[PDB]
């Protein structure tokens, strides 16, 4: 005996009494939500957001370092012999052992 356990029924919107919809019940709620504001995020976050990502606001010295390096190369080539790296941030250290 189940008494009250049997209550399960198959439910699907599909097309019957909905015409063509995504939201369950009411045609007025469906059009204004599932096609407007659902695709408003598709227009602002994806299309208008594509301008940002990494392009435009430099992004962690990716474009800045190229202009900085080139002027340091031409300066050190004319005067000094060693190119850039020779002794990195070390000038007269107080012994070792």
């Amino acid at each position: 005996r189940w008494q009250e356990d049997p209550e399960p029924e198959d439910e699907n919107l599909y097309e019957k009494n909905p015409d063509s919809h995504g939201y369950d019940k009411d045609p007025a709620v469906d059009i204004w939500n599932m096609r407007v504001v659902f695709f408003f995020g598709f227009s602002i976050v994806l299309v208008l957001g594509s301008t940002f990502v990494a392009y435009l606001p430099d992004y962690r010295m990716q474009e800045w370092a190229r202009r900085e390096a080139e002027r340091l190369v031409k300066y050190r080539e004319a005067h000094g012999l060693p190119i850039m790296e020779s002794n990195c941030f070390d000038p007269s250290k107080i012994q070792l052992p």
């Binding site: 439910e11 976050v45 957001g49 010295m61």
Partner: protein
């Protein structure tokens, strides 16, 4: 800027009328996610702190954007479910996602370890209520108890680990202050200091041993498929392994050596089982073990090249596996069973969703540089500098990466469907929108993947 408008989503769902609810929760979340990309991306040479230590800046975390990307997406696929039940029950399990979103933002933003810990385990509470309810099949509790007693058993040793560091060496706090840290002398007393910090992240990032936490959470489905995306967020939610290994134990890598070997066998054996399995959701559940196992390998090498592949794979897997689970949910809502063999039929009945099935499957493999080629290949290149033998084992895994994807395709690409009579409508306008909102952000990362991998990039 980030927190406060996320908190205001809680009174939004309750104050709004019974006919609406879903329209307000999805639309308002999309404009907050736009503003996250607007401000967080700006950084100098070393990423400077945001404000006072409550929520801080991002140094090597574009993974926060992914949480903001799923912030509306965790509501789209859950629309098919929950609709049959009470209106008060609908509002409750939207706010549990809002609480998840509240705690998940706090984990990635706040540059801490002490207060980060009480946000690390805090994500487990809303997911527990999510998993233990709405499960269509039984053994919810044989997955719900296993959800905590795997994680909390490994993560509670952080209380005896993190506090022990701040009592001896200054304070943990900002991490930008954390340069007081002296290299570990490597002794038998220092063994359990390293293990307690690791074992917490050894569970959330699944290995070969103590990996059964993940398949139980995926097979026994919480709600439809949108909550399984939050289970993907928990894998990448254990991101503190990027921070602990670099700062707290720089000299210690000798004790990491056995843990790499465990994760290396968690690549062949975890893939082999992911072939003859019956459940469609399980064949994503075990492929997610091996894909996140690649990250654990990269962390323990500690090379600057490996962290590039590590940070890429966190975002790569976070939008490919979640994409695969939405496809699993789209078959679960029509056939009403997670069986792969029974649910058979693409193109003939599902004409446009089959192209989304192809794009999601091939992204698991190394396609033209989307994110996974910048993810997987970078780790394989970094493993050779560790040892020459690795690619002999890693190359075999590259064969079976096809065997996740193509076996999921072929066992659905048969146009028979003799037993099945359902699935009249192929996909609703929201269902096709779900599939586009996962792949097209990755397709935009082809042009500039600087905001996909950035630990000193």
């Amino acid at each position: 800027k980030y927190i406060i408008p996320t908190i205001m989503l809680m009174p939004l769902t309750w104050l709004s009328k019974n006919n609406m609810i879903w329209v307000n929760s999805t639309a308002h979340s999309l404009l907050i996610s736009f503003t996250s990309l607007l401000l967080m991306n700006q950084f100098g040479d070393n990423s400077l702190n945001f404000s006072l230590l409550f929520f801080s800046d991002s140094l090597s975390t574009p993974l926060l954007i992914l949480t903001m990307w799923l912030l509306p997406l965790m509501l789209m696929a859950s629309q098919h479910h929950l609709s049959k039940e009470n209106l008060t029950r609908k509002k409750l399990f939207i706010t549990m996602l809002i609480s998840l979103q509240l705690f998940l933002i706090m984990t990635f933003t706040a540059m801490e370890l002490i207060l980060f810990y009480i946000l690390f385990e805090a994500t487990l509470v809303p997911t527990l209520i999510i998993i233990t309810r709405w499960g269509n099949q039984t053994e919810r509790l044989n997955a719900g108890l296993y959800f905590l007693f795997y994680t909390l058993a490994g993560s509670l040793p952080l209380l005896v680990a993190l506090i022990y560091i701040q009592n001896t060496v200054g304070s943990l706090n900002f991490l930008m202050l954390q340069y007081w840290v002296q290299p570990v002398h490597n002794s038998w007393s220092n063994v359990f200091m390293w293990l307690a910090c690791m074992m917490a992240f050894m569970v959330k990032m699944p290995l070969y041993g103590l990996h059964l936490w993940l398949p139980k959470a995926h097979v026994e489905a919480p709600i439809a498929g949108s909550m399984v995306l939050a289970a993907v967020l928990l894998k990448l939610g254990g991101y503190g392994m990027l921070r602990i290994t670099l700062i707290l134990n720089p000299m210690t890598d000798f004790m990491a050596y056995p843990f790499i070997m465990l994760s290396l066998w968690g690549m062949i054996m975890t893939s082999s089982i992911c072939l003859r399995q019956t459940d469609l959701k399980s064949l994503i559940a075990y492929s997610s073990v091996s894909h996140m196992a690649l990250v654990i390998v990269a962390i323990l090498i500690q090379t600057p090249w490996s962290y590039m592949g590590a940070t890429a794979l966190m975002i790569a897997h976070g939008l490919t596996s979640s994409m695969l689970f939405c496809l699993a949910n789209s078959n679960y809502e029509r056939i009403h069973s997670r069986t792969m063999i029974l649910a058979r039929g693409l193109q003939t009945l599902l004409p446009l969703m089959a192209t989304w099935w192809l794009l999601a499957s091939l992204t698991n493999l190394a396609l033209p540089p989307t994110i996974n080629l910048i993810g997987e290949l970078f780790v394989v290149m970094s493993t050779f500098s560790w040892s020459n033998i690795t690619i002999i084992l890693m190359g075999v895994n590259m064969v079976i990466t096809a065997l996740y994807s193509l076996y999921m395709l072929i066992m659905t690409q048969r146009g028979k469907y003799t037993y099945h009579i359902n699935n009249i409508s192929p996909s609703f306008t929201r269902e096709n929108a779900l599939m586009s909102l996962h792949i097209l952000p990755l397709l935009l990362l082809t042009l500039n993947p600087k905001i996909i991998l950035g630990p000193l990039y």
